[PDB]
Amino acid sequence: GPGSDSEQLQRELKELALEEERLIQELEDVEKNRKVVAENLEKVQAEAERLDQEEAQYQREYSEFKRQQLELDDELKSVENQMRYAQMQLDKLKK
Amino acid sequence: GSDSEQLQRELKELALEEERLIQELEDVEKNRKVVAENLEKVQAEAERLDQEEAQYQREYSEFKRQQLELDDELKSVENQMRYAQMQLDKLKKK
Numbered sequence A: 001g002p003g004s005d006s007e008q009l010q011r012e013l014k015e016l017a018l019e020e021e022r023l024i025q026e027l028e029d030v031e032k033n034r035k036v037v038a039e040n041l042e043k044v045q046a047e048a049e050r051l052d053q054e055e056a057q058y059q060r061e062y063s064e065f066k067r068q069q070l071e072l073d074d075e076l077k078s079v080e081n082q083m084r085y086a087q088m089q090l091d092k093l094k095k
Numbered sequence B: 001g002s003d004s005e006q007l008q009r010e011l012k013e014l015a016l017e018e019e020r021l022i023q024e025l026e027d028v029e030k031n032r033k034v035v036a037e038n039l040e041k042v043q044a045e046a047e048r049l050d051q052e053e054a055q056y057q058r059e060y061s062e063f064k065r066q067q068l069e070l071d072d073e074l075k076s077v078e079n080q081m082r083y084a085q086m087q088l089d090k091l092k093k094k
Helices: A002-093 B002-092
Strands: none
Touching: A002 B002
């Protein structure tokens, strides 16, 4: 019994050792892979946060141009209205 | 005659302002559509980054799980080797 039982245990230990070796390598490599994915995730989240501020700036710019456009068009209506009035005064003097 | 000349001077100054305003409006409309375009570009990029974010969060979770799982696989193997070696030693001791 004991001799054959010992040979079976020796075979089991050799199988375990080979798997141990493999796992140790796989753990070294997963650690490298996790470092890359952590970098990638941070970079994309940092970029998204930056783009949010860019978008906020453009929305302010857009709103400002829109306001300017309304202000200018109203100034133009005033000029046009003043010119008609002046011409009407001139028309009275031209006669 | 003088009132007329005054009004003619006024109309000339106004026509200059009208010209200036019409140009300023052309330019604001140009500036406005550039910003609208920047906006469209920003929004497309934001969508792209959202999708890349989702991808990397998935990969993050997958590799974290893989490390947790591998480490427990190694611990199980270490436990099994200790037990097997203990049995081996006992059989030697007869």
